Nucleic acid binder design. Structure first.
Lengths: 202, 202
DNA sequence: GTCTATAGATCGATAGAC
DNA sequence: GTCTATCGATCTATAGAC
């Protein structure tokens, strides 16, 4: 409970200001306590950031790794993964997708989180190579997906909560743009297998 | 001469580590002097950052604003602006395109640089509306352009230096992808006409 | 579990010798 | 124009009272 208020206050501060510019004092004041009291619940300011980062990088990678196994066309699997990731990043209270873009993540310690983010890019890149071959356009579907980070709000209200029966329009547009840059036709009933394939991957 | 070595070392450190994590001592050690000696050539560490940022934001904004005036089709000007910007961002020794995405730019003091980049995004978005109307796809050409920042090297060697008669393959691909997400056909002789409009804007 | 107080260390920037 | 030396501010984390 008090651990949750610290992570929520840190999520807001880190996404808006970054890790280095945010101070433990600022985190404690948002909680309503004083700076030293944070260290009862967490060992270090870094550990708060790692907890938030680990709750964003790893569900994104296991979701894409689960949707690559399922039986569909490469265009269908790529369209589903792009739509699923955007729906992931549009379902959080804060724009936690920003946490990886922070300069501090470029530190040489995040080899654990670098491999998960390179594995996530490998899923995007490999499905695209299956569509258009050894073409530099294969690297575009992943950056088209992450561009939602620059579009969604960060005021504390969830842009599009998750639904079993619906998909956000931003997720559908970015998924259509991903197939478009590869010159691939859009599969029939994109949204209605993705909801089933998302239901498949638990 | 000494100002350029400080700016080059700061360009490397800021792009790779960010503004907050980089120390004036680290900048001075790359130049080969002591930390205090930096303040002979520059008033503050912030002023070093502003000089590098202003040498990237304003050539990007005046280039796009100059090519929007010229007489051509909206698809031709959008393809040209995307291709020209990518080659700009591929022509610097360091990946200075990263400097605006740093958390420190989000400060409420950078109101000059926020308005300059909102004009730059407006050029991309307005040309897209001329192509696809009031469609959320109008925001994709700019993010497709900026994705080159996540693709180019940052070791100190220029990925593709400038040429009067040629364009980098990455510049052509992102420009073809930008029109593709809008469902627009590519104009005849894209690469060979953009070279003329770049010669136009000096 | 929260507090006050402070250690310990870094950093930005200034002053003045040469 | 570069140097040594230092001030003052800010910050992470710890110690110990309660």
């Amino acid at each position: 409970n008090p651990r949750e208020e610290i992570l929520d206050a840190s999520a807001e501060l880190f996404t808006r200001q970054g890790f280095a510019t945010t101070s433990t004092h600022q985190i404690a004041d948002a909680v309503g306590i004083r700076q030293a009291s944070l260290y009862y619940h967490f060992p270090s300011k870094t550990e708060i950031f790692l907890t938030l980062l680990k709750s964003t990088v790893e569900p994104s990678t296991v979701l894409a790794e689960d949707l690559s196994t399922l039986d569909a066309g490469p265009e269908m699997r790529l369209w589903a993964i792009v739509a699923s990731e955007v729906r992931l990043l549009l379902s959080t209270k804060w724009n936690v997708g920003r946490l990886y873009q922070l300069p501090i993540v470029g530190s040489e310690e995040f080899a654990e989180y670098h491999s998960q983010r390179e594995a996530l890019t490998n899923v995007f890149r490999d499905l695209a190579t299956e569509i258009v071959g050894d073409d530099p356009r294969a690297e575009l579907p992943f950056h088209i997906t992450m561009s939602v980070i620059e579009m969604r709000r960060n005021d504390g209200k969830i842009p599009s909560p998750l639904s079993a029966d619906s998909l956000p329009e931003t997720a559908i547009m970015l998924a259509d743009a991903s197939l478009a840059v590869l010159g691939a036709p859009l599969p029939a009933d994109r949204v209605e297998k993705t909801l089933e394939l998302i239901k498949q991957a638990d």
